[PDB]
Structure 1
Amino acid sequence: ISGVSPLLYFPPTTTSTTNREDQINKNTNIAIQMIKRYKGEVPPHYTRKSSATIEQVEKEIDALLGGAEKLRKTSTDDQPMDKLTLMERCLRHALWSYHKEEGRYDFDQIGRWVVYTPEDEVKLAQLKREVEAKEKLAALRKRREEEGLPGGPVPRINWPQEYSSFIDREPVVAKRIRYDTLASTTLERDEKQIES
């Protein structure tokens, strides 16, 4: 670093009194403020002109389609469809769109009763990666807490090389502070409030 430094560097854990219920909470309220400023505002209330649970609707659909199973006849994809097939497709499409919006990400049936366009397949793939990635990340971030490993991510760096590689200490010196500060925090939110 072409010079003897005026002072040494130490791990900047001076402000070590950082709580885990506090750090997550601070991230939580940052998100809610953004979610609201991005989505907009809660839309005006809408009143169900009917009253039935999605489970009741699904059961009614199953009963309706069960009586016509004998009459229902399969056919080639390119051939014209039947009344029963059209009714089933419409009902299942609506039901599974509602389920996917709610959160019941059952991709096996969504890929069947909702995929009719390449755009649908693309957005499903994005949704299938996001869902299954968030799940995996949770196990990594939970286990990390069973060894006490620091939540925050850590770059693959060899500071003895970085110190030697650069010319003036200040730029690289500052780099240590940022990453160390990043590694000493938990980048997670309260998903209960977010979902709410």
Structure 2
Amino acid sequence: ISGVSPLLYFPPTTTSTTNREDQINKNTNIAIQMIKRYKGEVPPHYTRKSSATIEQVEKEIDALLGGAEKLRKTSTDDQPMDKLTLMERCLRHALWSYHKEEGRYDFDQIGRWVVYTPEDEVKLAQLKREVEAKEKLAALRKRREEEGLPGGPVPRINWPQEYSSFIDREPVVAKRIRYDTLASTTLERDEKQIES
């Protein structure tokens, strides 16, 4: 900051009307395009051989396994299984794979009926962190939005020290510009469309 500078810094919010809607909408346009490229082409259409709902299938499975309850017998992890147990495991594994792909995340049942290999366990643990974290982030941004605090993150900086510690003003100004726009802008997508 050596030397008398020509101008004073003011918040670079010239286009303060960066309507949250438009910024989110642009984020949606960007996110979808990249996802489509990464995945590739929509897979070729498939016609169902039979018509049935997931809920109906789950109800039928529960009915089938409910009759064979007395017939079931406690078996240890290291003992050979019962035909009943084999059927239950297969059905629940398929059902909960479908549910984990759909979006419903009962992280207890998905654990019991889908987790076999330690690699599978690691993947589940990663999923549980992501789901809970994203959710709590929305809650934080919800309270943050209700307060009007800037949606974007704000670094823990003391710019008065920054100008003092530098010898040239150009990089110092730029850092303020970058982090000012970051906080000024929003960084959320229209998840409705992302999921779709």
Q: By how many angstroms is 1:58 displaced?
A: 0.5
Looking at structure 2, the residues matched to 156 and 191 of structure 1 have their Cα atoms a distance apart, in angstroms, of 29
Q: By how many angstroms is 1:68 displaced?
A: 1.1
> Residue 150 of structure 1 corresponds to which residue in structure 2?
150
SS in structure 2 at match of 1:146? helix
Normalising by structure 1, what TM-score?
A: 0.98
Looking at structure 1, the residues matched to 110 and 16 of structure 2 have their Cα atoms a distance apart, in angstroms, of 48
Looking at structure 1, the residues matched to 78 and 12 of structure 2 have their Cα atoms a distance apart, in angstroms, of 67
Q: For structure 2, which runs of at least 5 residues remain unmatched after alignment? A: none
SS in structure 1 at match of 2:7? coil
> Residue 116 of structure 2 corresponds to which residue in structure 1?
116
- Root mean square deviation, CA, Å: 0.7
Q: By how many angstroms is 1:55 displaced?
A: 0.6
SS in structure 1 at match of 2:59? helix
State the identity as a percent.
100
Q: 1:20-42 CA distances to partner (integer Å, 9 max, x unpaired)?
A: 11111011100010110111121
Looking at structure 2, the residues matched to 127 and 182 of structure 1 have their Cα atoms a distance apart, in angstroms, of 28
SS in structure 2 at match of 1:77? coil
Looking at structure 2, the residues matched to 118 and 3 of structure 1 have their Cα atoms a distance apart, in angstroms, of 62
Q: By how many angstroms is 1:63 displaced?
A: 0.9
Looking at structure 2, the residues matched to 195 and 180 of structure 1 have their Cα atoms a distance apart, in angstroms, of 31
Looking at structure 2, the residues matched to 67 and 117 of structure 1 have their Cα atoms a distance apart, in angstroms, of 30
Looking at structure 2, the residues matched to 118 and 63 of structure 1 have their Cα atoms a distance apart, in angstroms, of 32
Q: By how many angstroms is 1:115 displaced?
A: 0.8
Segments ≥4 residues shifted beyond 6 Å: none
Q: By how many angstroms is 1:13 displaced?
A: 0.9
Q: By how many angstroms is 1:66 displaced?
A: 1.0
1:100 aligns to 2:100 (yes or no): yes
Q: 1:118-174 CA distances to partner (integer Å, 9 max, x unpaired)?
A: 111100011000000010000111111111111011000000001111111111110
Aligned pairs for 1:52-91 within 5 A: 52-91=52-91
SS in structure 1 at match of 2:2? coil
Aligned pairs for 1:1-196 within 5 A: 1-196=1-196
Looking at structure 2, the residues matched to 66 and 154 of structure 1 have their Cα atoms a distance apart, in angstroms, of 55
Q: By how many angstroms is 1:50 displaced?
A: 1.0
Q: 1:57-105 CA distances to partner (integer Å, 9 max, x unpaired)?
A: 1111111111111111111110001100000000000000110000000
Q: Tell me how many residue pairs correspond in the alignment.
A: 196
Looking at structure 1, the residues matched to 75 and 25 of structure 2 have their Cα atoms a distance apart, in angstroms, of 56
| Bigger mean CA deviation after superposition, 173-182 or 67-76 | 67-76
